[PDB]
Amino acid sequence: FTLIELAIVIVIIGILVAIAVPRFVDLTDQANQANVDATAAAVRSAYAIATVQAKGIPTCDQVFANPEGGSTSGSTWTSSDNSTTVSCNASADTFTISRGGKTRTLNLTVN
Amino acid sequence: FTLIELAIVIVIIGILVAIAVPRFVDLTDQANQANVDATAAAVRSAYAIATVQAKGIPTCDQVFANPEGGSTSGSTWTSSDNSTTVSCNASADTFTISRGGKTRTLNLTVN
Amino acid sequence: FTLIELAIVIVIIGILVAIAVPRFVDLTDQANQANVDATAAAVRSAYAIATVQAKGIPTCDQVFANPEGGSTSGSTWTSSDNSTTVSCNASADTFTISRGGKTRTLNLTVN
Amino acid sequence: FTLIELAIVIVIIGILVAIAVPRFVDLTDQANQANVDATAAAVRSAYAIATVQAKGIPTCDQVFANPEGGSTSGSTWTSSDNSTTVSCNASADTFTISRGGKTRTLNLTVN
Amino acid sequence: FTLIELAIVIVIIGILVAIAVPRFVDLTDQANQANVDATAAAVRSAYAIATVQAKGIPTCDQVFANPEGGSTSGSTWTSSDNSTTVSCNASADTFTISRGGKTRTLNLTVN
Amino acid sequence: FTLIELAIVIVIIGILVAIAVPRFVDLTDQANQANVDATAAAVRSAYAIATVQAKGIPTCDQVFANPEGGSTSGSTWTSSDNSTTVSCNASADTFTISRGGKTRTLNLTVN
Amino acid sequence: FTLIELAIVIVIIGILVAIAVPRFVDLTDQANQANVDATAAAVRSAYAIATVQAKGIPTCDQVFANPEGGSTSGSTWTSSDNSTTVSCNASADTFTISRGGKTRTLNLTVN
Amino acid sequence: FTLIELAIVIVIIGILVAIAVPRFVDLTDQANQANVDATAAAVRSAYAIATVQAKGIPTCDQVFANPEGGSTSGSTWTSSDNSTTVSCNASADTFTISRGGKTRTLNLTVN
Amino acid sequence: FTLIELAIVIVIIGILVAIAVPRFVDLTDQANQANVDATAAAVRSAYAIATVQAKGIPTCDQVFANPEGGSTSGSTWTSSDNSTTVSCNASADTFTISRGGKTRTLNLTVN
Amino acid sequence: FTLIELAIVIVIIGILVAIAVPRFVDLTDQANQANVDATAAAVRSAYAIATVQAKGIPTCDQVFANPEGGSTSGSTWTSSDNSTTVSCNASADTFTISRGGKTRTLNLTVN
Amino acid sequence: FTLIELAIVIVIIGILVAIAVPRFVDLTDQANQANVDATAAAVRSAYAIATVQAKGIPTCDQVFANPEGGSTSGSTWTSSDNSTTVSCNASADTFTISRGGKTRTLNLTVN
Amino acid sequence: FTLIELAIVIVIIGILVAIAVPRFVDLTDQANQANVDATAAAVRSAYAIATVQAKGIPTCDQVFANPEGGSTSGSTWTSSDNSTTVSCNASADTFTISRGGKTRTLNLTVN
Amino acid sequence: FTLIELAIVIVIIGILVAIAVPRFVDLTDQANQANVDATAAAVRSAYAIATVQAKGIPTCDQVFANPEGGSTSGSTWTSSDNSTTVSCNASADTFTISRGGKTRTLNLTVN
Amino acid sequence: FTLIELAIVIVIIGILVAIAVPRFVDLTDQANQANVDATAAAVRSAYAIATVQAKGIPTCDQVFANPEGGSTSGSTWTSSDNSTTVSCNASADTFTISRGGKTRTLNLTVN
Amino acid sequence: FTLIELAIVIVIIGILVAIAVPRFVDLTDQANQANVDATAAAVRSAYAIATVQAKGIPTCDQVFANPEGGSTSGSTWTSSDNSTTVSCNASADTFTISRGGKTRTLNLTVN
Amino acid sequence: FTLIELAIVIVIIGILVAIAVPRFVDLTDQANQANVDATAAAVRSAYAIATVQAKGIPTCDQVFANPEGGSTSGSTWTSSDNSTTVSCNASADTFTISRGGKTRTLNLTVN
């Protein structure tokens, strides 16, 4: 390594470490409301399929039979990963999807 | 494409592929019993119109003259698409409508 | 057409094609005996009018002169429509009315 | 509306628009001959009542005095609605009932 | 999957899951009163046919002989599916049709 | 930007651009036959309503008075958007619905 | 939910919400004139039965004794549901049936 | 950092910042017409359910009782998020759905 | 080269080889789970397109017809590069995507 | 300059010109396959945006409207610098990206 | 110092000041185009992050919120050291990065 | 040693100790700013690698896991030799590299 | 040679052998640490080039492929002259450069 | 000159011509290897500068453009004085510096 | 002084003034080329130090700031004694050292 | 001793004491400037060795550690015999050698 070589490296490093570089903006909250919409779209469709199967106002278990990509337990379908609890309450007649703070309550006739 | 951009895409894809999505529940069997009822409703009406035309117990051909949205052959009116064979037998005095397994036999005086 | 609309139509069709609906009971034979009585009532009256005209035991042609609503031929008054042949035989001294199987023979002095 | 929901609606619409459905057979001509008989039955009865009132062969006006459910004019009783003109001609000694093509001429002694 | 593609999907999902979507209103009770009327219409007609057959006040068994689309047992015609029990009581002289709460009692002379 | 950072981006881009990604399958032809069925279902219903209004075999203009979501012209109801020409011909006694190649001819008594 | 999936849903929704769909034409007024005829047919028959019972011109109460499917009060038989008031006036010698605007006055000898 | 390392980074950056990268095309207007169709599909269905409930031409409030995923106020159902005002006017006999410029007017008999 | 020049190079080399320099962290496993999600997102969409094409529960071959950027063989779509085997088994009714250890099983009705 | 000073410089030069020094490994070919992937990722996204704009299978010009950082000509989008010709052929239904030997052909429905 | 010692120094100096010695080639212009590329890479990424935050076409201020290693003023992000002015103009819909003569204009939808 | 020899040495020493000879200019401060740039370049890269590992905003310990050629302690990575303390403060959201007076503060989202 | 000449030489030799004359300070150890730094700088760069070639964590042989000015044997690159053994051990994940006592161990992920 | 003076000169000359006096050791060969190292150090640096200029593997003429203190001819840079021929051969990919027997071959990628 | 003593002095003087005695060979010209080399060696080093200070191509005044043992004036560093004018000309890009006829021109980038 | 012998000695002494005989010219001042140059040459070299040892600007004690042939005291190296005081002053940044009137001040960076 000569003296002149390092001098030229000092020049180049000054330029090449003097650039715009973007940072990690956390956009989970943005995607969570997108997720909770997309889930809520399926919950409507699943309910509409349950009504053809049940030929009447379907039960909350019959509604969660239709969605896939996540398991059920009692009366709360959660996604494959532990989020998006679409919890209903047949007495109240309403589903409520909630990814991670961002939520979306929808009211359908369940018994 | 920067490193930080892909990192943010890895975050978003995790969320947006973690939703309820409904599946194709086959509800043909449900609609077939609805079809075979709706057809059987018309077969009653068609028979009642045949009785005014014939001024008496009408023949099985006179009964299939009245329904539309499907062709006849001998003594079996089938729908436009090949289903819903409302087959009678004048000796037995009964029509029998059958969409695709789901069926509905009705007994009227035919000669 | 939405999914929910057809589901509701499937419910309604099940109910509205689940009713009592009466059938064509052939009651011609019942009316034929009623007809042959009503005709026989007139044949008595017509004979009684013939006796005042003829001032004696009337001929079989004089008796069929009185009834109306049907033509004569030789010695058999038939109705307007081809039924109810009230045929007499002056040698046997008896009329016989017959609509369509159901019959009613009456014996009066004819020459 | 999800993609899967419409796909299921496409299946159901195919089935539920594939049924026998009866058509309007025009049976006026059938009922017109029934009407003209029922009217002709009353014209006989009305004439028989006129003969007790008149104590003799009754006039054509005296005969139309008895029927109801329709007005007279000169010598033609028409029904409430403009049909069923039972027109007589006392010179010819015959009534003729005519609903709408289907007719029934009856011959009684009128003066 | 690029970052910009998911961003556009987040926009579209917001719009396409923001629509009116109708719910399953249970209209069985509406159709039950329609059913019980349509059945009661047939029970009148069947009784009127029984009176021509019986030439008098008909028995309760003779009345249920005429309707079709459902079986009898003792003195209660039920529809094909277990509903619409048109039960009479010859001592009380009245039929009573009842689909599923919605009912229609009619009083005819039965022996 | 260091050398090692780009090397890691080269690794990630290889993986993240190596996925299944679905393509636009044109399913208009599928929906056109679904449309032409749904339209044909309404044309039947509209005709049945026209028969109650007209108390007889209705005219082709009276039939197109009932459907909505599209304009008429002479004797061809087209949808709001220029498709689904349900064209009749009263002389031939048949309607014919046609979305965009996929068609459905139905024959009812029109004058 | 991928971008391509929603794009295909946008195509399908355009087609499936572009159909003829019939509207509720109010045909009560049509059925009211049919009702008031059918009621008026029974009022004639009931009067004819009253004349055999009374062996003479029957009273207005004796005439309303015969019809069923509705109650009486003073001198006005109304149907089970509050409509179709067949009101007579023995002084005027005429019944008048009126469902709901559509009416039918008939004149018979009542005392 | 050696001189040769930066030289190689200068080569790589030239290549890796020389790619196609897609831009955000605003497709709200596309989805708004899809939304306003999907909403208009439900408004038809909701009206058809209102007609079974009301057993007649339903009121504008009865029609907005059926849709879900958004609130009402007076006579204008808006979606959960402030868009898609399906405003009717019972005097004019027409609903009008409007997402955000893209609109869809439909005419049904409302009182 | 003077003595003083090398002395100054000895000073500079000490400083310029005394810096933080990042190392290659292997983030394939991170991208593999991102890949297997993105692939699984497409497999859902492709299945939903297959259901519109097949108008029913689609076959496993019809589902792999839709994805692009990789070839099929028998019943296993692999990516362009040999990874991401989305293997189904129609008897078991489930797809399973697997990039390179990181996997994602999804259950849809396949025949 | 003394004799001893140069002797010490002869010692130092021997050591300081006896080091590992890395060479320019040409890694363009490595970055070209990374480039052609990153470009191909955008071509997929751009096509998916074209499908929402075109509401159907988009033209090859509509697809190249979306990418940026390079110009188009006829039917070949090239980057800002003359490389990465993503050339399609609508008849063949396939794009082909090629940086500089390293290439990546992808098949989408273009018209 | 002897005579012979200096004579030997005269020999050595002749050799040791007879070598290749490299000169300072100014390679700022080379690094400036590398810088302006690396900055332009970040400006793309920052814009793509702004689109997820803004859920739409982002403003020019929202885009400069994401890059780091330099300050903003009005509508021109400059690096920490006074160079690399990535100046946009929302009316023209294009960013332009310029290190020091070497520049790179990129066109994205900004409002 | 002769007199003439020393006289010649006196001449030569006058010339050979009459030359330009360069001095030690301390250029540590120059290299320190070059060092603190090169370190700051790695701190950016290390942070970008931490974001892929952490799939989110990474912790300050996860960021110092990636750089090499120096040890950590608590929350301050120092070089192998005791200099270049890149100290962060997760509460303040900023790293600060400092070789020996010459410093470089950079602000990234750390938690 | 005269007496006075030697006397003057005795004077001059006293002065000219009474000077500062510098000694050979052994500065190999100083240059060895400079060498081992300069070598270690190249070993970092060579590793960073190996990572682009290998597209992953490179092998120890791939790393020694890049440096020049010295030969390899098994897993130890030595300089042209027998010194500066940069020996790695892939199991331990660390290179160690050692000129001649003065050493410099660096830890990078090698397999 | 006295006798005693010369006698004393004979004594002194004996002493003053009885001393150590060093001889000319030819140390060109020592300096030639020092020269050929110092030249080879510059040839490395010059090559590293050529790579930034050429942005790739530089030509042999571009490499000899950087060194100074000597002329070029075809493909052999010689020093100002006719020695130190650093001759390359781009086909063989290696420079070779040679002062005067003592040589130093170095292998770099030249084209 | 005896006769014999002088005779012996005559003998000795003959011998002692019959010796080789060296002459003053002027070797300034030899040392001037050695000087102008040693000065030129420093001018190279001083320029290399100026490039680290200036972080770029240094000015001619910055280059003469580094050498010592002589004063400057305008743009010509002369030694302490008036010789060795290393005169540059920034426009021509070359220094020229000249002791006293013997000269040495060297070409470096000066501004 | 004869008379003639002394006469001949008188002749010879006249000749032999009639010669050029050189005198002692004091040339200390000439050698002192030669000494102070030779010492100053070593002081430069010693300083250059101190800079490699100290790896920076060396102290005045470190500089006098290198010369030999004379002792030090505090900050003034004197020769073996008491002359040639090379006295520095670190605050002033300059050495000054002085043999015996004839002096030579040189300015180097000392601390």
DSSP string across L72-110: --TTEE--SSS---EEE-TTT--EEEESSS-EEEE----
For CA atoms M64, M65, M66, M70, give the dihedral sign: positive
Residues 6+ apart with CB under 8 A from P94: P88, P105, P106, P107, P108, P110
Q: Do chains D and C touch (3 or more CB pairs under 8 A)?
A: yes
J37 contacts on F by Cβ (under 8 Å): 13-14, 17
Q: Does C1 touch chain G (CB under 8 A)?
A: yes
- Whether E3 and B11 have beta carbons less than 8 Å apart is answered as no
Q: Does D1 touch chain E (CB under 8 A)?
A: yes
- Whether D87 and D80 have beta carbons less than 8 Å apart is answered as no
Chains touching A (at least 3 CB pairs under 8 A) are: B, C, D, E, F, H, I, J, K, L, N, O
Q: What distance in Å separates the CA atoms of residue C49 and residue C62, rounded to the nearest whole number?
A: 9
Structure tokens at I20: 């933080």
Residues 26-85 of N with CB under 8 A from L: none
Chains touching P (at least 3 CB pairs under 8 A) are: I, J, L, M, N, O
Please report the DSSP string for chain A in residue order. --HHHHHHHHHHHHHHTSS-EE-----HHHHHHHHHHHHHHHHHHHHHHHHHHHTSS--HHHHHTSEESS---TTEE--SSS---EEE-TTT--EEEESSS-EEEE-----
DSSP state, P99? Answer: S
What length is written for chain F? Answer: 111
Q: Does J92 touch chain K (CB under 8 A)?
A: no
A56 contacts on C by Cβ (under 8 Å): 11
Q: What distance in Å separates the CA atoms of residue O85 and residue I53, rounded to the nearest whole number?
A: 92
Q: Distance from C39 to chain D by nearest Cα, in Å?
A: 14
Q: What distance in Å separates the CA atoms of residue C10 and residue C27, rounded to the nearest whole number?
A: 38
SS3 call for F2: coil
Query: CB–CB of J19 and M28 under 8 A?
Result: no
Number of domains in chain I: 1
If you measure CA to CA, which chain L residue comes closest to J3?
A: L16
Strands (E), M15-88: 21-22, 67-68, 76-77, 86-88
Query: CB–CB of D17 and F41 under 8 A?
Result: yes
K56 contacts on H by Cβ (under 8 Å): 24, 26, 28
- Print the domain residue range for P5: 1-111
DSSP state, H59? Answer: -
Of J33, J38, J109, Cβ closest to residue F24: J109
Chains touching G (at least 3 CB pairs under 8 A) are: B, C, D, E, F, H, I, J
* Resolution to 1 decimal place, in Å: 3.5
Which of I3, I9, I15, I26 to probe the L interface (max L CBs under 10 A)?
A: I15
M67 contacts on N by Cβ (under 8 Å): none
For CA atoms K88, K93, K94, K95, give the dihedral sign: positive
Please give the angle made by the CA atoms of O37, O41 and O47, to the nearest 5 degrees.
140
Query: CB–CB of M52 and H4 under 8 A?
Result: no
Q: Do chains E and J touch (3 or more CB pairs under 8 A)?
A: yes
Residues 6+ apart with CB under 8 A from G14: F81, H33, H34, H37, J55
Query: CB–CB of H32 and E21 under 8 A?
Result: no
Q: What distance in Å separates the CA atoms of residue N36 and residue M86, rounded to the nearest whole number?
A: 25
K12 contacts on N by Cβ (under 8 Å): 27, 31
Chains touching M (at least 3 CB pairs under 8 A) are: F, H, I, J, K, L, N, O, P
J9 contacts on A by Cβ (under 8 Å): none
Query: CB–CB of L49 and B6 under 8 A?
Result: no
Q: What distance in Å separates the CA atoms of residue J42 and residue K48, rounded to the nearest whole number?
A: 13
Residue N31, class by beta-carbon neighbours within 10 Å (0-12 exposed, 13-18 middle, 19+ buried)? Answer: buried
Smallest Cα–Cα separation from M97: which of M108, M85, M107?
M85
Hey, which residues does I105 pair with through a beta bridge? I96
CB pairs under 8 A between E and J: 14
F106 contacts on G by Cβ (under 8 Å): none
B18 contacts on A by Cβ (under 8 Å): 35, 69, 79-81, 83-84
D32 contacts on B by Cβ (under 8 Å): none
Residue A103, class by beta-carbon neighbours within 10 Å (0-12 exposed, 13-18 middle, 19+ buried)? Answer: middle
Residue H33, class by beta-carbon neighbours within 10 Å (0-12 exposed, 13-18 middle, 19+ buried)? Answer: buried
CB pairs under 8 A between M and O: 3
Place of tokens 């509406």: E30
Residues 6+ apart with CB under 8 A from I85: I76, I77, I78, I97, I98
Output Rg (C-alpha) for chain B, integer angstroms. 26
Q: What distance in Å separates the CA atoms of residue M90 and residue C17, rounded to the nearest whole number?
A: 81
Q: Residue G71 corresponds to which amino acid?
A: S
Place of tokens 């269905």: H45
Query: CB–CB of M48 and H4 under 8 A?
Result: no
Q: Name all contacts of K56-64 with Cβ < 8 Å and 24+ positions apart.
A: K56/E11, K56/H24, K56/H26, K56/H28, K57/H24, K57/H26, K57/K109, K57/K110, K57/K111, K58/K110, K58/K111, K59/K90, K59/K110, K59/K111, K60/K88, K60/K90, K60/K110, K63/K88, K63/K95, K63/K110
Smallest Cα–Cα separation from H33: which of G13, F28, G1?
G13
H13 contacts on K by Cβ (under 8 Å): 34, 37-38, 41
What length is written for chain G? Answer: 111
Q: Does H6 touch chain E (CB under 8 A)?
A: no
Q: What distance in Å separates the CA atoms of residue E67 and residue B107, rounded to the nearest whole number?
A: 10
Structure tokens at L69: 């050629």
Element (H, E) at B44: helix B28-54
Task: Residue M43: count other Cβ atoms within 10 Å of its Cβ.
Answer: 25
Q: How many CA atoms lie within 13 A of D29 on its CB side?
A: 5
Q: How many CA atoms lie within 13 A of A109 on its CB side?
A: 14
**Experimental approach taken:** cryo-EM
I2 contacts on P by Cβ (under 8 Å): 48
- Whether I69 and I79 have beta carbons less than 8 Å apart is answered as yes
Structure tokens at L92: 């303040």
Q: M8 to each of E36, L61, L110, N12, how far by Cα in Å?
A: 154, 79, 83, 12
- Whether B84 and B42 have beta carbons less than 8 Å apart is answered as no
Interhelix angle D3-16/B28-54, nearest 10 degrees: 20
E16 contacts on G by Cβ (under 8 Å): 6, 9-10
SS3 call for F28: helix
- Whether J109 and F26 have beta carbons less than 8 Å apart is answered as yes
Q: What distance in Å separates the CA atoms of residue F32 and residue D14, rounded to the nearest whole number?
A: 12
Chains touching J (at least 3 CB pairs under 8 A) are: A, E, F, G, H, I, K, L, M, N, P
Q: Do chains J and K touch (3 or more CB pairs under 8 A)?
A: yes
Q: Does J5 touch chain L (CB under 8 A)?
A: no
Helix H segments across C1-110? 3-16, 28-54, 60-64
M26 contacts on J by Cβ (under 8 Å): 11
Query: CB–CB of B5 and K52 under 8 A?
Result: no
Interhelix angle N3-16/M3-16, nearest 10 degrees: 30
- Whether D88 and D104 have beta carbons less than 8 Å apart is answered as no
Chains touching O (at least 3 CB pairs under 8 A) are: A, I, K, L, M, N, P
Query: CB–CB of N42 and A2 under 8 A?
Result: yes
Q: H53 to each of D74, H65, K12, how far by Cα in Å?
A: 54, 11, 114
Element (H, E) at G66: none
In degrees and rounded to multiples of 5, residue G44 shows phi and psi of -65, -50
Smallest Cα–Cα separation from J83: which of J70, J99, J71?
J99
Query: CB–CB of C25 and E66 under 8 A?
Result: yes
Strands (E), chain E: 21-22, 67-68, 76-77, 86-88, 95-98, 103-106
- Whether P91 and M69 have beta carbons less than 8 Å apart is answered as no
Q: Distance from I6 to chain O by nearest Cα, in Å?
A: 9
Smallest Cα–Cα separation from B15: which of A83, D81, P11?
A83
Query: CB–CB of I37 and B13 under 8 A?
Result: yes
Which of D9, D15, D44, D51 to probe the C interface (max C CBs under 10 A)?
A: D9
Q: What distance in Å separates the CA atoms of residue O69 and residue J55, rounded to the nearest whole number?
A: 84
Q: Distance from C86 to chain H by nearest Cα, in Å?
A: 57
Query: CB–CB of L13 and K6 under 8 A?
Result: yes
If you measure CA to CA, which chain M residue comes closest to N12?
A: M6
Q: What distance in Å separates the CA atoms of residue B79 and residue D19, rounded to the nearest whole number?
A: 6
Residue F102, class by beta-carbon neighbours within 10 Å (0-12 exposed, 13-18 middle, 19+ buried)? Answer: middle
B34 contacts on C by Cβ (under 8 Å): 9-10, 13-14
Smallest Cα–Cα separation from E98: which of C19, G69, G70?
C19
